[PDB]
Structures are given as C-alpha cells and as structure tokens.
Amino acid sequence: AEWPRKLRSQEWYGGTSRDVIYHRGWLKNQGYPHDLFDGRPVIGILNTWSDMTPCNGHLRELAEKVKAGVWEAGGFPLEVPVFSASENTFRPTAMMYRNLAALAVEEAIRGQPMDGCVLLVGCDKTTPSLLMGAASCDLPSIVVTGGPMLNGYFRGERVGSGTHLWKFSEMVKAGEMTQAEFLEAEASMSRSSGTCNTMGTASTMASMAEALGMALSGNAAIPGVDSRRKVMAQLTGRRIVQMVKDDLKPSEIMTKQAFENAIRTNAAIGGSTNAVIHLLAIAGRVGIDLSLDDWDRCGRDVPTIVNLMPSGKYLMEEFFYAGGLPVVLKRLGEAGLLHKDALTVSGETVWDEVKDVVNWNEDVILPAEKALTSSGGIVVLRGNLAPKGAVLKPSAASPHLLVHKGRAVVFEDIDDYKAKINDDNLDIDENCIMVMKNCGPKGYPGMAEVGNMGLPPKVLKKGILDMVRISDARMSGTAYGTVVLHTSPEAAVGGPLAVVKNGDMIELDVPNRRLHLDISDEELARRLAEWQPNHDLPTSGYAFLHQQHVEGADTGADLDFLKGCRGNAVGKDSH
Amino acid sequence: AEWPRKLRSQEWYGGTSRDVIYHRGWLKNQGYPHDLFDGRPVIGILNTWSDMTPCNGHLRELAEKVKAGVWEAGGFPLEVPVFSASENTFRPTAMMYRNLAALAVEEAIRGQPMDGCVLLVGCDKTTPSLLMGAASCDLPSIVVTGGPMLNGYFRGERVGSGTHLWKFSEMVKAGEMTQAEFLEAEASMSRSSGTCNTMGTASTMASMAEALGMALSGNAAIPGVDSRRKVMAQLTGRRIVQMVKDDLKPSEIMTKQAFENAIRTNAAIGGSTNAVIHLLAIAGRVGIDLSLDDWDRCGRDVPTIVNLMPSGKYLMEEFFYAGGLPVVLKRLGEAGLLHKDALTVSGETVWDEVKDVVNWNEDVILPAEKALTSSGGIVVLRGNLAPKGAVLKPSAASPHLLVHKGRAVVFEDIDDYKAKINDDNLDIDENCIMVMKNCGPKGYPGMAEVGNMGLPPKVLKKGILDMVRISDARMSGTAYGTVVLHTSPEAAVGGPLAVVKNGDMIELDVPNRRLHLDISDEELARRLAEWQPNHDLPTSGYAFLHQQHVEGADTGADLDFLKGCRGNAVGKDSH
Amino acid sequence: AEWPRKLRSQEWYGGTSRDVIYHRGWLKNQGYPHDLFDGRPVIGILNTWSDMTPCNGHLRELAEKVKAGVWEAGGFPLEVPVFSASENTFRPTAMMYRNLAALAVEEAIRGQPMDGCVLLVGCDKTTPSLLMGAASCDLPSIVVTGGPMLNGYFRGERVGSGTHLWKFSEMVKAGEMTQAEFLEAEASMSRSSGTCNTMGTASTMASMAEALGMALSGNAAIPGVDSRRKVMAQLTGRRIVQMVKDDLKPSEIMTKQAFENAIRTNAAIGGSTNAVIHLLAIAGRVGIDLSLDDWDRCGRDVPTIVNLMPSGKYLMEEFFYAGGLPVVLKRLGEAGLLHKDALTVSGETVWDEVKDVVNWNEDVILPAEKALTSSGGIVVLRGNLAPKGAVLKPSAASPHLLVHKGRAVVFEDIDDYKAKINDDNLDIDENCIMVMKNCGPKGYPGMAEVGNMGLPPKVLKKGILDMVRISDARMSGTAYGTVVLHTSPEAAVGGPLAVVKNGDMIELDVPNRRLHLDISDEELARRLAEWQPNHDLPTSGYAFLHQQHVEGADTGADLDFLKGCRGNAVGKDSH
C-alpha cells in the first residue's frame, strides 16, 4: 500500500472528536507523549506469558526487546496478554482450549486499536492459536518463538524433555529402573526457560512458522536463554512497523506454496503429528484449501535429515549450532523441493534468505544418503477403519511393523486402558494391535495426547519396545513407536472405530496407505446401529460449546462457526 | 474443612507417577524449590493488566504485592493474565466481550492447578467478568480492586473523568465552550493510573465487590496510586491462603443477603445503572434468584448520601478521605437497612468490619437530613412499552422530568441519531421524548453506552441540559439525566420499543413505576406482527455466537449456556 | 545468640518517638504492611546488576528470587543496588575501582537499617568488593554468584570467552587467521547472561566464595541461565533470615582454615592469579594474617584436576554436569588436603555438604594419576628482582620455560609495548625475556590485565606461542603462558623491576622459587638511587586518592585506611 496513510488506529486516537478525546486522553494516563497518537503504526504485542505456562516464562522480558525495536522504528508498542494454552499444565488437555485462545486473540485484535501484531508464542498450542486469530483479521503479523530449553543432562547422559519421560516410564514397568531414578532425574530433565529440547510440538510449530515465512529467518532453533533470541525479538519489533506501512498481510505470505513448503519442512525435521491439525486449521482461516491429501502428497519422497529425538539422537541445541532450519530449507531447495519464490515477513524470498548458509554439523543435519528415513513424511492411511483419515509418523516408527496384521485388543475409554494394561490377566502378545476409542475431539473430550499407549510389562519384560497402536486421539511431539493417530471420524461421533470388537483382525500396510478391518461391509451396518454414545457429555459451559461445534481432526479440529477470514473492519464507535 | 488436606493442585503435582513428573518437573524450569509442591495452597493471581486497558496499568506492580503476601503465608503465588476488555478501547462495545472474558476466566481456573484465585480487577468490565468466572467454578476467590484515578484539575477547577466529557460535549454545542478549550483539558482529566474518579461503572462495581463481601473492607475507595492500595494487595494475598485452607467459597459469601446489601448500597453511593446488569448476571453464576423486582424493592426508599459526581459535587478522593465504604455500610446498619450477619472473605462479618469507623467529612458522606435525593435507589419501570423491564438513575435525573408526558421523536438507529440531532430543522422542543432503537445486546450489537443522548443544540442554547431519553442501550456510570435505560426487550427481538413512531406520546412515572405508551392496543399489536428485522446478520465468528446465545438486560445479558456454577471438578488426566 | 532479640534495624523502626516515625512512616509509602517493622530481620539484597556490566545482566531476576526466599522465612527483603565495576567496560581498569566499590558497599551496610546482607555478585570484581565491604562491617552475609555463560560454539568448534580472544589475536599475527574470521566469532563467544565460561577471574572468585564457606554448596558452577540458579537464589534468601537470628557472621566462617582450603582449592580448579590478590585483600577486612608465603605453602604440591580452559580443554558447563565444586572439595578431603571442620553459611560443615557427591565425568574432574600438572598451586617467586613478591600460573605455562634464562627485552610502558612489538626489526627471539614496566597499582594506574603480552609476530610464525613474560601487572583468569605476574613492588615506587635494561639476563626458577637478575649488586644499587619517577601525576580526584593510599600486590592492592573490620556499630541518630 501507499505510505503515509490513515491507519485503523486513527479511528480511536486520531481527530478532535468527543469519542477520540475519550480514547486518547484515557491512554495518556499511562504517560505517553502527544505525538504517539499522530498516526504512526500502533503495534500490539500479544504475549502468552503466564506462570502457569513455564515454556513461556521468559516471554515477558522478550516483550521488552520487541518494544525497543518498535520504538526505534518509530512505532507505538502496546503489550496485550492473551489466553495461553499449555499441554504441561492444562486438563483434560490443552487442545480443547486452542480455539478458545484463537477466539479470544481474534476479538482482542479487531476490537482494540492495533495496526500490527507481534505474536509472542512458545508452547505447543500458543503458536497455532495466535496464527488462527491473526489470520482471521489479516493485519500485518509476525512471530517470535520463545525458544527451546537447553539439553537435559542426567548422570553425564543426554536426556530429552519429553522422550526420556516415556523411555523411563517403561524401564520401571519392564524392570530396569527404580522410580527413584525416574524421580531423581526430574530436576535435571528440564533446567532452563523454554519449550522442549526435542523435535516436539513446540519445536515443530516453531519451524512451521518459519517455513511459512511468518517468522524471521532462524527464529526456530535459537534457545530461549540465548542472547540471539533477544536480538531476534528487537529486530522483529523494528520490522513490524515497516510491515504495517507496506501492508504485508498473512494472506500475502501464507500461500499454497508456503503451506506446501511447511509440509515438506515437516518431513525433513521429523515434525510432530500435531503439525497436520494445526496447519489444516490455519489454512482454513486464511483461505487456502489444504486437504489432508496434500500432506501425503508433499510429505512422500522427502527424507528426515535432522538427527534429533524422538526420531534421532541429539537435541535442539545441536540443531541450532549446525545452522538451524535455514540449513534444512536450503537442502530442500538443493533437491528441487522448495518454492524459492515464497515471500517472507522480511520482504525477501525464502530462498534469498537461506541460499548462502552452511551446515556446521553433518552428524546433526545429516546428508541425504545418511538420512534417518528415505521418505519420512507423515503418511495418511485411508481405509474403512478410518474412512476420513489416519496418520502415522514413520521416522520414529519401527520399520517391520509398518506392514503388520494382528488381533485387536479393544479399549472403550482411557479408563478401560488404564485398568487392563497393568493386569497380567489378558491375552496380549507382541504381535497384537492395541485399539482405543472415544478420545478424539468430542471423545476425551478435546483430543488428548494419549496415542502413545504404554505397552504391558509382560511384553516389555521380554525386551520388546514397540507394538502397533491405533487411536482417534493424539500423542506428544516427543512420542515414538508405530502409532496411528487422527483416526477420523472419531468414535464419539458415529465412526467405524467405535464398533471395533475384541479378537478381531486389523491390517496395517503403510506403502499402499491402508488401515483396514478385514470384516464384511454387511457386519458394519449391524455393528454401526447397536452403537449408542458412551462418552461423557457436558450439559453447559465451554465444553458444551466445544462439543456441539468442534469439527474433525481431518479438517483442523476447528470450530465450525469460526472458520474463515472475517476481516479487520473497524467497528462502530463505543460511545 | 480439615486442614491439612490434599487440595486439587496435588492432582497435578502430587506424589510420583509419570503424569505428575511431567507436570511438576515442567514447572521447575522456572526456578522453584522442591518443597513448594508438597501441598501448600497454589494461588492463581488473575491479572487483567494490559497496555491497552489504561485503567489497569499499575496492576503488575500490584500483582507483585499479592505475590509477596502469598510467600509470607506459606503459599505458592502464580500470576495468570486474563482477557481484559475496557470501554475506553474496545469496539463496538466492551460489554459484548464481557461474557468472553468470563468464559476464559472460568476455563483458566478449572483447567489449571490453582487452589485459590486472586482477582486483580479495576476497569469497568473486569470486576463482573472475573466474578462471573470465579463463581462459575466456586473456587476460593477474593477481589483486589485496582483503584480510581486522582482528581483531575483543569485551570484550578475540579474535573470528573467522563462526567466532564458529556458536560463539555454539550457545552460546545451550546456555544458556551470551544472545541479548542475541550482539547486543552484532554490531558488534565486523566492524570494517574486508575478508573474514573467519579462514581462510575468501575467505581460502582468496586463498591459492590465490597458490599458483596467478595473483597476486603476498605477496598473500593483507595486511589490506585495511594501507597495503601499496595498494603491492601499484600494483605489480600495472605488471607487467600487461609481462605483456601478454610474453603471459603464465593457460594458461602455471595448470599441473597449479601446481594441485598449491595442493591441498597448502590443507592447510598449513587451507583450506576450497570451494577444492575452485572449483579443480575453474576447472580446466575452463583445460583441465586435475583430479579429486576428485587432491585426496585430493595432500592426503593434508600437515599444517596455520597456527594460525588455525576449525582453530586466531589470525586472519589474526597470519598476515601471521608472514610470510604465502611462509613456508608455502617450508615446502613445504624439505620436498619443492612444484614449485619453477612460473612466476608476476612472471616469476620460486614458489621464486624464497619463497626468502629468514623465519617471524617459530613459534606461528602452526607447525613440523613441533607441527603441528595429522597428515594435514590435505581428504579424499575414496568409497562406496555417495557414489559420485561427498564431502569432509571434517580439521583442524576431532573426532578421536574420524572413525571413528564410529551411527544416522541424517534431515531431508528444510532446512525439515524448522529445525522439529524445536529440539524437546524427538527420537530423537537424541551418537552419531547428522545427515543432511539437498535442499541441492545443484539442490535448495536453488545448493548453500548449511548443512552445519554446529546440534546439538540437548539434546546441547549435556551439553557436546559435535561430531556427525557428512552433507549434500550446502556450508559456510563458517569452519565446524568432523566434517561430510562435497559428497555428490555430491545427492538431487533420484537420488543414493544420497536414500534414507536414520531408524533406519539409516552407517559413516564417514577413513584408509580409506570413507563407507558398510550395508544390503542390494536395499533400496538398490529405493528408487532407487521414489524420485521432488517436482516444483514453475521454468518460466522464470535459476533455470530453472541447474536444467538445472548439474552437481555432483565436477565444479565449473559450467554444462555453459561449460567450456573459448574464446579471446580477436575476433568481427566492429560496423558 | 538468643532469638528473639532486638536487631540493629529496630534502632530505626522500633517503638514510638519522633525519629522512628520519621523512619518507619517514610518507608511505608512504598506499600508495606505495619507488622513488617516489628523486629523480623531486614535483609538487604545488594545487587551489582547494571546494563553496563553484562556479566550481571540477569541479577534483577535473581534478586526477585531472593526476595521470595525472604518473604517465606518471615523476613523483610529490600534491594539495594551497589557500585558495579567490570573489566569489560571500565577504563583504565576495573581494579582501580575495586576499592571504591568496597568503600560504598561498606557504607551502605552500616548506615542503612539492614540486619543481614545478601551479596548478589557475578562479574570479576564484584565478588571480592562485596566481601571486602560486608566483612569490614562483619554483619551476617551470604553470596549468590550470578553464574557463568553457556559454552560458545563457533562453526561447531568449542570456544572460550576470553581465552579464544588471546588465542585468535595471536593467530591473526601469525597469518593463521584473518581479522574477518575473528570478527565473525565475536557474537558466538558470549551468547548468554553470565561471566566467562572458562576458569577465569570471575569463575575463580565464585569458587573461592564457596571454598571460603561464604556461599551455599554447589553455587560456583551453575550456569546463570540454568533454572537451578534461581533455586539457589531463593533458598539463599531463606537461609540468611536464620543466619541473622543465629548471628552467623563472616568472622565466624572466613577463618584461617577457611582461607587455607581456598588457596588449595585454587590449585585443584586451575584458578587465576587474581584470586591471590583478592584473597589477600579480603583477609585484611576480616583481620587475618594472610601472606604470599601462605599461598606458596598451601599451594605447593597440589594438582589441578579440573580440565577447563585455559589450563585444559573443556568449559564451565562440563564442570557443572561433572558435579561441580563439591566434587573438587571432596577430592581434597579424601586426600587429606582439606580442613573438614570449617563451618559454612549453611549451618553444616564443608565435609557435611561435600560428603555424598559423585563425579559424573572423570574426563573433566580428573583423577590423581591423569591430573593436569604435578604441582599446580600458584607459586610465589622471591628474589633480588622481586623482594616483595611475584606469582606465576603453573597449570597454563609451558613446562620447558619454567627454568629459562635468556636476554631481557624491555618495554618502558604499555605504549612502548604497543609500538615496537609489531615492528619487523627487533632484537628478540624465542629465548628472550619480555619485561614491561609502569603497569602496577600506581603506574598504569590500577594494575591492569596486560601481563599476557602478545608475542612478536616473527616468533609466532615459527610455531611457538609461549615466551617468558615479566610484568608488574595483572592478567585475566582466561590467560595462559609462562608469565610471572604481581611483580611487587612496581616501577614507579622504586621496585628493582624499574632498573632492568635491554641486554640483561634474568634467571627464572619455579621449583626453587627464584626469580633472579644476575648483575653486580653495585650496578643494581646505583640504578636504584639514580632512578626518578616521570612526574606528571594527578592533582585532584579519586585518581589522586588512589595514587596515595593504595598499596601493592603482596598486600592486596587495598587502600591503606580501609583495612580492618570497623564493625556494624550504628552511629548516632539522624535527628
């Protein structure tokens, strides 16, 4: 657009109206000079900091750096704290509140006088929610990631916050670790401010925001306690004042090329399984028809070149010294797998920003021939047990179980699981297939991170660490093993997964992308008619709003009345 | 109950197991000693501070005082920012987002491991929302009002925040003031951190939070920049620890009698018309049968003894030095208009706290004989034109217009107001009735503060600043005049207000509580079945959800699915 | 003593009377409840934080943890910023202002109503100064070291803060590196908040503060950005309350034995040559007869078992994960080189705290056989050239140059160095001795870090990075080489170092402790009585006061009128 011009904040603060004197003089009570209401870009800094949100604990001092950058560039920074959904404190799960934060963030952008937004994000659900709310207003926006934690060291051993949680949870069931060790290692597993140090959900979405071009280059892997995270914060504050002037909207950046670049960036790093839902949700808010097919198309024939847990061996620290994500984006461009013309928040193309970077560690960002998997893209398993969709993370999955077929052990609820697994009075062998239902959106409710079902000790005691597992739930970004997620439609909405009976047989074949229940179509309609809903239904509250209006994980698990871009039209005067 | 006991927080941080090590160890990365997770109460400090809400600017500093007060009593203080909506920024109105805040404040209390809540409020819409949320969970809660601003002096003369905005707006249209003299005062009205220095919407709801017992005694009047507000916050942090141990829930405090004292106290202080809605809406979250009839009942024959603007002369400073609210409540106990037995968050009763207080200024807290107005309680006007209800502020109205009967001059919407009222040609005089429609919870939308309609400049120049104004909207607590408000139900829902037309006559009676449109009920009932809404409604978003599940002023303008205390019952585990 | 009792703070805030109401009521304006002045200990939190001292940048955040730790133990925390001098900013040197800080830190403890002191230190000159001040008052005190930086990685290779600055400076003069490759590393060396990540001047003095017992156990090694530094600070705030009640003064802790463990521990860690001066200077403020002879005595035949730079290989991170200082002190107790009886601020003994600790990395905390150097204690070299003293760092020197004897090449002042050393023509080879004068406490002035003289580029290009360097100055704890330092007394005070001239030969012997200039004592004693200072001295200011009352390295470079504990005896009342 053409600068100078009248910005949307001048409806509040510009003029000599009675309503303007009401809005301007009220903000002046905080000690702002008169010329800050002259039309210069007002920048809202959306901070998800909270003491109940420890992966955002350092985000408050980062807001100070953003403000300085906005001051230097001639803007007007204002800090706006928003709903902070974190999976390490919320219950039943932080996922049921992701759209609530997206709803709250949206109304906090449209109703308050801000011309541009800085998204201070960090934890799992912080990044997508603020991207859902900001994309629905289409104001110039930019992302500042909090950063990962430092490497957890326990007795001279590298420990990943998240992956080593499950790994030690089995070594006490299989009989190789005292719960004291599982407790003495608690204080050393998480020892800095930031999110997980594995390629978990927060580390994945931090990379997704950069591959989408919504964050400055290199924002993904800078540790939260690193100095260059504070430099990134102040330079982001400088630029958002320009993005408001040049009118650089999320619609102009998050294009179909950007969403595709993110899907391929997800395979190269071993991205979390949750990156599918969140990218599908953000797409619906912008206007891009991203189908779940686009994940299995762009994800295939793309190797995982990043050697980080859970799929690998190192943590987010070594990923940053090797060069970070810009090295991964160059390696995609070197293989003809990158939209080199995708515009970024910097005004440059994604290629122009990463074409001249160096890989400082080939043991971390591996060469292509030494990748963890020749095609580690998240696969989609269309079939009859999951007609709408089902996903699997191949990089962490066992190679021989990807083609497997066994006897179904069934759990109706998570309490069914959490009662029979520990009981040594069940027919369960290493070649079985655990199946849980009623854990999707409406099921759990909210869809929880319980897809990584723990194996029984009688299987773990032998020395077996992976079994095929199917659920309509999710799992942590730090999880591993052969696990099928997003089994849509879920059980608690009338899906074939709800009528899975014990003893039955399931076929798993990743190559042809088929998860099939070898049962005649005639026996479905009789199974699918004696099914009566079982999940806990809420009578009122926000759970009622979620329940009646949440969509399916094959479409982003959004809220049906929230999908799309509503715009940032300045509302009518408050007086 | 029995202390010691296991609180709801220990469901997160209690003992061993994998889920707890994921919860406790993830929070330890913010530098917390091990013993803080033993079982001592975890106190969530809900802070509505925001750079965008300047009536709350000093609350970060207040939060650190509450933190110190929780460390001293052996607690665990944690700050959790919540959604902040204030009338001085949000558009179209901050009332449309009141339920959104109550929605988020509810779900942040239930999902997160807080044993007790501290409600850091200040602005107009922050006191009810955090009560509509904390009561819907009924967890131990306490209020720390931010504080009002200092008195604004303009050229040596006293000036009220907001009150002198509607007073200088009309003085400009009457030729008695220049817009340039209005601009010069813009920076001298609001000169400290806090809310309006009158008995406005934010000063009223701070008083109710004390007459309801939901805050400490002597809490609604201390200026936000006074040092004794920081003492109030630090001691309010000590009490909530013992409150959690003793399980001092809002249901044990906000009784029908606790509300009864507030409705009467709203008369004695000259409170706003928005305390009606907010007390009606808050009542549902506690499960109490409040009503517009309970307001007229308990409010009738109670005089306003506080001489603050807009009803009187002085500002909130003089009120504080005069003694504050403890004098006004003691004035109602020595007069037999107060339930002295009601319990407060302090562990003592209302009378036990307001017993030995002195009135250090009879010019401010006036005695019975010199009282401002005979019957100062907010009145409720039943009638054919408002069968669901309508309210009026008696202490600020003109006594010669309470029983007026004149021509009706109609404005279809707010745009039909702000286009004709400043025309030289308009069939309106000093005796006409100003009626405006489509300004309710579904019409504006959000029920805005546009009730105090500015008179025609041709009527102001004669020398009169009061005409009967009838609207279905709200108006600020700083507003004045013979304006009947909350005309439930609004126009776009088929209320009989929608059928009024130019030339008609309206009866207004206050001691009889009769708001009457005298036409043939035939002519009425025809216009009802013949009227149609204008269509053009939102098809998605929160503005869509509001248009569907919201209600009317007679109830509390709440969302229908949100009433009722849903309890602090933890859901199920996250993993 | 007997708790409860009246502490020195009650002389200010005790009881009634006019002086007290002036003291107590004047502090209440910051929002403090009444009961905090009853008698509970007032804890002054001396914070050396400054935007100018980046090795202390995170101390404000640390101060708030100490505050929380004092509120919990029923104390009264108050933050008092003090003078901060760090080598990375001050000119001509931060040592010239060390006594100035100790002067101000002393007078802020005596004059102000603090019962106990918390010493928030971090940078090089902040640990001794706040000990030289807190001991001169001998009020209950405790140390909270800020913490070292994270390991800096440059192109995948490890890099030491400061150590790789003297290593890349010489590699540039030897043609083995470019100044542009030196500039690129500037931002990858220091990337977190803290001091040098080597065993530098600030990491050494943090270790001494723990071997002296003046800090909690496991306090010198935690990285400043590690979460467990915030736990260390919060618990250090609880202890000082009980420390004040029990009257646990530094005189009861910093015994001759407590110093004796530190002097030996300085060997085991590979400590700096500046721990000598700072322990010598600190000793006077406690009233203990330390000496350069006590250093050679207790340091002789103690090996450096810590493999950190500049003496070894790794950085301070590996030291922390290896176990830290508790392993190094336990290694001296199981070897019979430690007074296990010494008391610490924890209420337990050194052995009681370092008893059950594990060495999680024998490659870092090396065993006796693989130890770095045989006798690693700092040596003291008596002789005709240095009758008052001279020190050497054995673990960093070249073993083939400890017994060198070659030609002396003299530089009159530092300007006479930085003008000839980079000339193609200079009569110096690999066997000459580099001697530089006028760089002591009165010569430079301030005794700067210029001992590690950069070799001539014509000698570096042969492939040798070590030549015998003799100077009366200091050098950083990150420095390396066969450099004899602290050549007391300096030149401008008539030390025999002032008479050395080109062509002369110097004997250096370390196992015999002989630094010898072999000329006719006639030729010596003549040059003494014939030499004159250059005049041109300051005529006013603090640089004048320094030139008069300062001393030499053999004593502690203190101001003469400053030695001795003057007690916490309150003066007389202010009114």
Side-chain angles (χ1 to χ4, degrees), chain B residues 10 44 81 85 146 148 206 232 254 299 353 364 449 454 465 553 565:
Chain B
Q10 289 270 292
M232 168 62 49
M254 282 199 277
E353 298 282 359
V364 176
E449 303 179 349
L465 320 165
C565 159

Side-chain angles (χ1 to χ4, degrees), chain C residues 216-259:
Chain C
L216 279 201
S217 189
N219 179 91
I222 325 172
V225 288
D226 194 304
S227 299
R228 294 159 290 191
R229 179 65 61 169
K230 308 194 211 185
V231 198
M232 168 62 49
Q234 178 155 350
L235 298 189
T236 315
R238 300 171 175 177
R239 176 63 195 161
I240 188 58
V241 181
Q242 205 81 13
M243 285 181 56
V244 154
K245 300 182 180 181
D246 306 335
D247 190 79
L248 190 37
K249 334 166 309 183
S251 285
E252 293 184 10
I253 289 201
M254 282 199 277
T255 81
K256 179 81 162 183
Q257 289 181 356
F259 280 80

Side-chain angles (χ1 to χ4, degrees), chain A residues 188 191-192 226-228 321, chain C residues 153 191-192 226-228 321:
Chain A
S188 196
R191 51 82 160 251
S192 82
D226 194 288
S227 299
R228 294 156 285 194
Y321 312 130
Chain C
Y153 300 98
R191 59 93 156 253
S192 81
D226 194 304
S227 299
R228 294 159 290 191
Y321 316 119

Side-chain angles (χ1 to χ4, degrees), chain A residues 12 23-24 28-30 51 54 79 88-89 91-92 111 186 192-193 418 444 540-541 561 573-575, chain B residues 11-12 23-24 28-30 51 54 67 79 88-89 186 192-193 418 444 449 541 561 566 573 575:
Chain A
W12 285 263
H23 292 302
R24 195 202 314 158
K28 282 182 180 166
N29 86 330
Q30 288 306 318
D51 279 328
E79 208 189 303
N88 35 63
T89 49
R91 284 170 79 169
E186 166 176 73
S192 82
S193 206
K418 296 186 169 173
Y444 193 83
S540 73
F561 69 98
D573 320 324
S574 46
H575 281 101
Chain B
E11 307 281 339
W12 282 261
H23 287 305
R24 187 197 327 166
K28 290 179 172 176
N29 84 316
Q30 285 299 316
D51 270 336
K67 285 194 165 212
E79 193 179 338
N88 36 73
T89 39
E186 176 191 286
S192 81
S193 282
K418 300 191 172 186
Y444 198 75
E449 303 179 349
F561 65 91
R566 285 160 277 258
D573 204 331
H575 296 336

